[PDB]
Amino acid sequence: GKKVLIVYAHQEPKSFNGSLKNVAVDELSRQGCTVTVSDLYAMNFEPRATDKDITGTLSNPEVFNYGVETHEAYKQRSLASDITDEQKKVREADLVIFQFPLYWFSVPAILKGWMDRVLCQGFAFDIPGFYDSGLLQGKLALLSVTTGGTAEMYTKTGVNGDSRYFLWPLQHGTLHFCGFKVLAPQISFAPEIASEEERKGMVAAWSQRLQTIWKEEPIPCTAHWHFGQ
Amino acid sequence: GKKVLIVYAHQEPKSFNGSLKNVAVDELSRQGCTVTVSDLYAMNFEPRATDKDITGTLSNPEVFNYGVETHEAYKQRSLASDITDEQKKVREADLVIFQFPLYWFSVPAILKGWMDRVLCQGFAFDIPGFYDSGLLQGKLALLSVTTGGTAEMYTKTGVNGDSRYFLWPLQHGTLHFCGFKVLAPQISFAPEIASEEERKGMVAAWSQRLQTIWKEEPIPCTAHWHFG
Ligand SMILES: Cc1cc2nc3c(=O)[nH]c(=O)nc-3n(C[C@H](O)[C@H](O)[C@H](O)COP(=O)(O)OP(=O)(O)OC[C@H]3O[C@@H](n4cnc5c(N)ncnc54)[C@H](O)[C@@H]3O)c2cc1C
Ligand SMILES: Cc1cc2nc3c(=O)[nH]c(=O)nc-3n(C[C@H](O)[C@H](O)[C@H](O)COP(=O)(O)OP(=O)(O)OC[C@H]3O[C@@H](n4cnc5c(N)ncnc54)[C@H](O)[C@@H]3O)c2cc1C
Ligand SMILES: CNS(=O)(=O)c1ccc2cccc(CCNC(C)=O)c2c1
Ligand SMILES: CNS(=O)(=O)c1ccc2cccc(CCNC(C)=O)c2c1
Ligand SMILES: [Zn+2]
Numbered sequence A: 001g002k003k004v005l006i007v008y009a010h011q012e013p014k015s016f017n018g019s020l021k022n023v024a025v026d027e028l029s030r031q032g033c034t035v036t037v038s039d040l041y042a043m044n045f046e047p048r049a050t051d052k053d054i055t056g057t058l059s060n061p062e063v064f065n066y067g068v069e070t071h072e073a074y075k076q077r078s079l080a081s082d083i084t085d086e087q088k089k090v091r092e093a094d095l096v097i098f099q100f101p102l103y104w105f106s107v108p109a110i111l112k113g114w115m116d117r118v119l120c121q122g123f124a125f126d127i128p129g130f131y132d133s134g135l136l137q138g139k140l141a142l143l144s145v146t147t148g149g150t151a152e153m154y155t156k157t158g159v160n161g162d163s164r165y166f167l168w169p170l171q172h173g174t175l176h177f178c179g180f181k182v183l184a185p186q187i188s189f190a191p192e193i194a195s196e197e198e199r200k201g202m203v204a205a206w207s208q209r210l211q212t213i214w215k216e217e218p219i220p221c222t223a224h225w226h227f228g229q
Numbered sequence B: 001g002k003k004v005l006i007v008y009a010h011q012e013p014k015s016f017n018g019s020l021k022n023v024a025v026d027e028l029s030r031q032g033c034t035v036t037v038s039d040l041y042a043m044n045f046e047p048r049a050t051d052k053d054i055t056g057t058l059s060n061p062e063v064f065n066y067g068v069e070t071h072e073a074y075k076q077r078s079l080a081s082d083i084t085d086e087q088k089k090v091r092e093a094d095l096v097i098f099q100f101p102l103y104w105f106s107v108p109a110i111l112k113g114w115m116d117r118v119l120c121q122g123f124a125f126d127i128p129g130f131y132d133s134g135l136l137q138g139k140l141a142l143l144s145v146t147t148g149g150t151a152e153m154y155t156k157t158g159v160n161g162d163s164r165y166f167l168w169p170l171q172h173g174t175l176h177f178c179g180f181k182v183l184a185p186q187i188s189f190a191p192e193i194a195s196e197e198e199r200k201g202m203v204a205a206w207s208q209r210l211q212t213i214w215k216e217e218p219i220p221c222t223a224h225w226h227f228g
């Protein structure tokens, strides 16, 4: 038995992202997995890191330091509840899938705020206690990304450079940092430009990949994997 | 004369980021420059890309596509005023400085939201008009970043790898894409563990650099500069 959390960042249920999220729910549910979706836009998820995220006495109420205050709020249990709700889903999950359209070579801000606010010190990492010693060790994570640009544009030579370049702050800087083993990204290139048939193909490929997800090895999440040479 | 926009993303006025923003204001103001600050947290700036970003009736109210609807709204002058207030500051600016602490090897989400919502199609980029022909061509941009991690941790075989690796999505995928010339980043490593004196030193060097900012050449914003 496995638990999966899909952190989903798209405004439109009818989108190609919505379809990728739905096929993931359908296929994982079919296998008998436990499935949870955090539909960030539907939740009106708060993306800003503010003093509203701590409800207790501040450690230093004259100079606000978000990192310090949320680490302390975590240990004390005075974090805002929207944060702790997400931490419970993550804590219980064996696999976390992030489903989102690429926005400026990165995640939409609403999903960036989920990372900023949910993956706090004490919960996701400590100092020391990061990368291979991250607190979410033993967990899997997978970025399922859609793009405006074609596969060709995301090669080394390559108007945008290699797709793996923009994956670094996310796969390595965030997921590996917190101790996840990172599965290979699912990148569904340029659905807006693609045929009906090619879109159906991309959706079907994701579905079919999920059938055997539990048998995959993670990627070696390193500079060499991301940048080569 | 010149106009400078500082897009500033820190919750605390007494912070090191706050000091760097303040020094930038003081020095560019001293030079006679026109200076504007967008203090994102104090403005409670909306980070989410939503259908509220378009006023009046939508181009396609059946299936919402953020990119298409904001492109059409830009052309038809139907964007939410917070977005158009920012676009005006950017349009008039000669130089845009982003002042922010590194969050997950990127910008804090409030600032990511500024990028998502302000740099819309038709305003910042188009087909064509991206990278070198981006619609903001001729403007300068500069990332002024603070870090938790020491300079050593940001070497190609330090714990975090090379600084330039995380610079890529911001400098190239965003700033260069919109047509900005990118000046070299100002990176203030690990102010929290630095001495009182090293801090004052980092603040001063920023101020010093700003004295000759208009003499600078933009980096070659290439794959080679970042990774090779
Ligand atoms: C602020 C912003 C920044 C961006 N930055 C970047 C960037 O840096 N790099 C980049 O490459 N792109 C960028 N983009 C483009 C963006 O990544 C794409 O627009 C997005 O990935 C497309 O995904 P979608 O779900 O919205 O597509 P959709 O428009 O929803 O889908 C495309 C088509 O597929 C159809 N569809 C939906 N479900 C199915 C299905 N089950 N079977 C067949 N067809 C289906 C839809 O009807 C639609 O016609 C950016 C966009 C924005 C708005
Ligand atoms: C969600 C999140 C994600 C993060 N991700 C990363 C990451 O990926 N990589 C990374 O390296 N770090 C990361 N960090 C750490 C973060 O980048 C640092 O905490 C931040 O950059 C420090 O800058 P500051 O302005 O907040 O420092 P401050 O704590 O505000 O300043 C440090 C000290 O300088 C003092 N000071 C202020 N002004 C002056 C002045 N004029 N002269 C002398 N002293 C002064 C202050 O009083 C304080 O004592 C993350 C933090 C958070 C909260
Ligand atoms: C190099 N081209 S790309 O398709 O890999 C690409 C890169 C960055 C982008 C940033 C914002 C939006 C878009 C959507 C499409 N824009 C246009 C030009 O109509 C982007 C597309
Ligand atoms: C230890 N390595 S690091 O300094 O390069 C680094 C890397 C990623 C981080 C992600 C979230 C938080 C922090 C610590 C920052 N806390 C405060 C007080 O603001 C990080 C520190
Ligand atoms: Zn890694």
Ligand SMILES: [Zn+2]
Pocket: B171, B172, B173, B176, B177, B220, B221, B222
């Ligand atoms: Zn570039």
